[PDB]
Design a protein around this ligand. Sequence first.
Ligand SMILES: NC(=[NH2+])c1ccc2nc(-c3ccccc3O)[nH]c2c1
Ligand SMILES: [Ca+2]
Ligand SMILES: [Zn+2]
Length: 223
Amino acid sequence: IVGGYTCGANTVPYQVSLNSGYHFCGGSLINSQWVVSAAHCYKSGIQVRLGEDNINVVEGNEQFISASKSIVHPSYNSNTLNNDIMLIKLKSAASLNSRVASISLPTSCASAGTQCLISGWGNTKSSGTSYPDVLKCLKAPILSDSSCKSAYPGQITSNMFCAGYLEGGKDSCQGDSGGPVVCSGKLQGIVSWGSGCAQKNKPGVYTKVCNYVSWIKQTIASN
Ligand SMILES: NC(=[NH2+])c1ccc2nc(-c3ccccc3O)[nH]c2c1
Ligand SMILES: [Ca+2]
Ligand SMILES: [Zn+2]
């Protein structure tokens, strides 16, 4: 997260860290055995780390659970990043409490102007790499589709939306990939892509979760 602030320990209880010997992506806990992340975060050997604040220190509240299976959306296109969503089933259920909680899936899509909270342990530099020890937060608004499409002509599908600032300086970045964009307590987006990070006129692009609610429910119901 570039230009964000320290969330505060466990203030984002649905945030998870996907780890393979280091933190490589974020995700959101949507129930005690399933996490939603981005398809471009796929790899084998994933350990999901819940209740984290400092990812380099065991401070208490952490629960480390291995992923039993990862389900990349069948129509995921790694070249356009269309359908950039993945579901991870945990080997055992997480113990939910005030520090580890699930976030609700939306019933309707959010409108341009809705203010959302994006969080993660991704890079904090737009120029350079600095990855933080504790979770970073950023409040950002969903932009209009005309603004999004004007910034990324021909690259925005109906399964994406832009959120952020056009002046630059505040954005999610690599490492934040797969993490949550929560608006009015509903998970509306997944950190997906953008041209660099926090560059002017190049807002972040997010997977539009409202378009996948039935796919998520059906998939979870059959696995
Ligand atoms: N600016 C942004 N909002 C953004 C967010 C997530 C990203 N994840 C990447 C990314 C780029 C190349 C290879 C792996 C990545 O996870 N770039 C990103 C950019
Ligand atoms: Ca920790
Ligand atoms: Zn990424």
